[PDB]
mmCIF file with all atom_site columns, C-alpha atoms in Angstrom:
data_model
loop_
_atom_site.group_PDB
_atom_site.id
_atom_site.type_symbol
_atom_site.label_atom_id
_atom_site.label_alt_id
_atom_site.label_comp_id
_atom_site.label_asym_id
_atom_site.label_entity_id
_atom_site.label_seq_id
_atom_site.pdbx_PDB_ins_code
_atom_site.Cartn_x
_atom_site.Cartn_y
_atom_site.Cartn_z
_atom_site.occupancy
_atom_site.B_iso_or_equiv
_atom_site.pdbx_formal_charge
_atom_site.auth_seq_id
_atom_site.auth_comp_id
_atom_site.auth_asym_id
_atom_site.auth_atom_id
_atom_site.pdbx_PDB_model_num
ATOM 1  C CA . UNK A 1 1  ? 15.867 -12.899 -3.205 1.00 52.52 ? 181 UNK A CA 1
ATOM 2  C CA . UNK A 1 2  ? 14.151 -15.521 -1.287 1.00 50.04 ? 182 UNK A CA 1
ATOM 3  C CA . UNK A 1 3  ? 14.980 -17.381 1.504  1.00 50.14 ? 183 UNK A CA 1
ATOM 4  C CA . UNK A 1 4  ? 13.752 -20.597 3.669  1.00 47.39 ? 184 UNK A CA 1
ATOM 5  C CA . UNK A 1 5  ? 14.325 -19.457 7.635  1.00 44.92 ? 185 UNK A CA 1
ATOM 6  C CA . UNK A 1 6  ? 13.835 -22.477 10.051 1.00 44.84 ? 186 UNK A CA 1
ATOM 7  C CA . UNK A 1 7  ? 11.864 -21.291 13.499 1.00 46.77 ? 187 UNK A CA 1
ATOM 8  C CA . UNK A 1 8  ? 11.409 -23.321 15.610 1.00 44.97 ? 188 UNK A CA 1
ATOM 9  C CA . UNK A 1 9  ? 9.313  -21.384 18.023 1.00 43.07 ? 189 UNK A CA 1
ATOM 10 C CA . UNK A 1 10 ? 6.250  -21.580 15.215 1.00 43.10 ? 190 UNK A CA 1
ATOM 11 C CA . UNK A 1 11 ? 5.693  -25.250 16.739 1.00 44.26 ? 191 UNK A CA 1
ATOM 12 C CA . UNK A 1 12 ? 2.214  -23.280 17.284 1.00 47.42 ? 192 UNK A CA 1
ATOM 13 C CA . UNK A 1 13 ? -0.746 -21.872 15.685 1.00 48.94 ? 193 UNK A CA 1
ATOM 14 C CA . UNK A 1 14 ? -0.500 -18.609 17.620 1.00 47.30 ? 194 UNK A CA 1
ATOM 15 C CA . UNK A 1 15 ? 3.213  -18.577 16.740 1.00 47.67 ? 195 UNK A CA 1
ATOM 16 C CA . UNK A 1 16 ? 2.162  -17.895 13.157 1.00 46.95 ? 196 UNK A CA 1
ATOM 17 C CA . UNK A 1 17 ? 1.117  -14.341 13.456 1.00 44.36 ? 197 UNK A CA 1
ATOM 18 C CA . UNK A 1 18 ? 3.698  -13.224 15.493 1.00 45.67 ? 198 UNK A CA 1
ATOM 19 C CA . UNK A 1 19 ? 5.966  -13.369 12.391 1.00 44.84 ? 199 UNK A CA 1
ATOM 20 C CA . UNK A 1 20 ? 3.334  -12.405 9.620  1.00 40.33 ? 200 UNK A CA 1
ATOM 21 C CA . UNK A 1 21 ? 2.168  -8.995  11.653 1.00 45.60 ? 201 UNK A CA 1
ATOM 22 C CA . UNK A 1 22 ? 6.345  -8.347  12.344 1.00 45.42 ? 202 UNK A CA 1
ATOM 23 C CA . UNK A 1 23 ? 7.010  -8.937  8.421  1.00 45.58 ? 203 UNK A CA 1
ATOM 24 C CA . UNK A 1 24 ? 4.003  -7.355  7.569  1.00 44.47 ? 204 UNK A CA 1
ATOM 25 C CA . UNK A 1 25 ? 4.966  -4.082  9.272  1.00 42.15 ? 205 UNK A CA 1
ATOM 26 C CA . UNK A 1 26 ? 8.753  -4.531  8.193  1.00 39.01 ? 206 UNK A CA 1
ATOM 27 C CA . UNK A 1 27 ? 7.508  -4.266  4.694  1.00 40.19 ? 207 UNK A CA 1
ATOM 28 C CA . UNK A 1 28 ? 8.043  -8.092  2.924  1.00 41.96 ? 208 UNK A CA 1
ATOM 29 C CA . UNK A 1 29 ? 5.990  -8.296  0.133  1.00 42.97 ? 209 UNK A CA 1
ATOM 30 C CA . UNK A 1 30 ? 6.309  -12.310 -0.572 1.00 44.31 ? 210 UNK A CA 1
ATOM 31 C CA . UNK A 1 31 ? 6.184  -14.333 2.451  1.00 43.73 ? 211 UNK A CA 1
ATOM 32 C CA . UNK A 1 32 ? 4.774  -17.699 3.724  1.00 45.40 ? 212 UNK A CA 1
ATOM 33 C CA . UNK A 1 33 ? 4.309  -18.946 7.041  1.00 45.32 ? 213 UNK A CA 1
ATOM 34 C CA . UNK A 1 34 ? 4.497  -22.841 8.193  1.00 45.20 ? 214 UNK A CA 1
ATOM 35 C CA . UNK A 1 35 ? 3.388  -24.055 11.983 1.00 44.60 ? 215 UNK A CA 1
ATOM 36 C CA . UNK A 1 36 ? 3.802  -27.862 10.156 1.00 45.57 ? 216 UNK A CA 1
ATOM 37 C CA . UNK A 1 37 ? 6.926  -27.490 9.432  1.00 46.38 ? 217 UNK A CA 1
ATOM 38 C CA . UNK A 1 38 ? 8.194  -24.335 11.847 1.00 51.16 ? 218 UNK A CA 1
ATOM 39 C CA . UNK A 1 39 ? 9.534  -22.710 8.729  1.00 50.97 ? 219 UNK A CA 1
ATOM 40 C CA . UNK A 1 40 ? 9.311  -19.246 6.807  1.00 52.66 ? 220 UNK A CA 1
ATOM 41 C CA . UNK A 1 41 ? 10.048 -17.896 3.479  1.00 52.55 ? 221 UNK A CA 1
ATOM 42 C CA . UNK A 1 42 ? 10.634 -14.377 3.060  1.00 51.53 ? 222 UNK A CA 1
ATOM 43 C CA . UNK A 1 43 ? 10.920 -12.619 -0.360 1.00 49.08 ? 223 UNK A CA 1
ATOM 44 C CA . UNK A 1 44 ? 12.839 -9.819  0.435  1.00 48.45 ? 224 UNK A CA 1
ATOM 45 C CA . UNK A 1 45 ? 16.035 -7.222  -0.794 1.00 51.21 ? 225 UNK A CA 1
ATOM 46 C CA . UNK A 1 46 ? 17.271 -7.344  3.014  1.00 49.51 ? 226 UNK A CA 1
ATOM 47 C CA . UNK A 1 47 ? 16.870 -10.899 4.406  1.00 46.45 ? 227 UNK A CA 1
ATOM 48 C CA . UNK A 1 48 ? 19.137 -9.296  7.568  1.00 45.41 ? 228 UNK A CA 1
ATOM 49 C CA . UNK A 1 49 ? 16.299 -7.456  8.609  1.00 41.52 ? 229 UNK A CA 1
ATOM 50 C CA . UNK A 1 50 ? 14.183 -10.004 8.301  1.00 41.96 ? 230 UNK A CA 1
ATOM 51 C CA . UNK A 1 51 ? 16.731 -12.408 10.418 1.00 41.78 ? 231 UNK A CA 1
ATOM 52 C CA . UNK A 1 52 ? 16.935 -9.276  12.986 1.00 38.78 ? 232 UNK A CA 1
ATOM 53 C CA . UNK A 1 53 ? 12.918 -8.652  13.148 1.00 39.05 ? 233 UNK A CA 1
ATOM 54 C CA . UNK A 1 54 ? 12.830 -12.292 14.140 1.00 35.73 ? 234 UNK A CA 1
ATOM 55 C CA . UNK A 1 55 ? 15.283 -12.136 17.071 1.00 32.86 ? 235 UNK A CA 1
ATOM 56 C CA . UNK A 1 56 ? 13.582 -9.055  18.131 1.00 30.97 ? 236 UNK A CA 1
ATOM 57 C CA . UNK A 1 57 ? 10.274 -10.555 18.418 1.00 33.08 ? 237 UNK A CA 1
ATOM 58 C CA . UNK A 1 58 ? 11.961 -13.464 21.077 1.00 31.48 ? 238 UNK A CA 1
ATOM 59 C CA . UNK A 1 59 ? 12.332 -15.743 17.828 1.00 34.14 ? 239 UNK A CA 1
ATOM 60 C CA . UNK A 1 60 ? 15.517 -17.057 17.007 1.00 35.06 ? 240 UNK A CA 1
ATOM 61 C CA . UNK A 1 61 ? 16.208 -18.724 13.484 1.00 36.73 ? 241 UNK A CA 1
ATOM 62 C CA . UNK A 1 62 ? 18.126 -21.621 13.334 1.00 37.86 ? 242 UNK A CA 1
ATOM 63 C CA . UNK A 1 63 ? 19.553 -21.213 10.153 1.00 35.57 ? 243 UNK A CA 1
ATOM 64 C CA . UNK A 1 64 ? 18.254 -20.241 6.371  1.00 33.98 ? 244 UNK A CA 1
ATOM 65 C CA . UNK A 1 65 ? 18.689 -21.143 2.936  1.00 32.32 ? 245 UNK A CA 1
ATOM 66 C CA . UNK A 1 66 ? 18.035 -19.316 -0.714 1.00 32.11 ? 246 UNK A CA 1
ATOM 67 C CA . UNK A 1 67 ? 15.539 -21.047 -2.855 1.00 30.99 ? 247 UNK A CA 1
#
């Protein structure tokens, strides 16, 4: 399922990576990155993991959403 995460901390262009390499490496396989709008999907089968790689790379989400 797929889901919108809001962070914040991607109010940069360096920012951007530091999420792609961590999902990368957690094994997404649909993702998108936003430093416009500090935002995330993931296409996943364990959004928790994503939620928890986040945290553990000093990046708290705000919240999510399904779309």
């Amino acid at each position: 399922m797929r889901y919108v995460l809001y962070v914040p901390d991607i109010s940069c262009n360096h920012c951007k990576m530091r999420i792609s390499k961590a999902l990368e490496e957690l094994g997404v396989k649909n993702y998108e990155v936003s430093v416009e709008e500090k935002k995330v999907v993931v296409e996943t089968e364990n959004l928790d993991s994503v939620l928890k790689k986040l945290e553990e790379i000093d990046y708290p989400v705000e919240s999510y959403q399904e779309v």
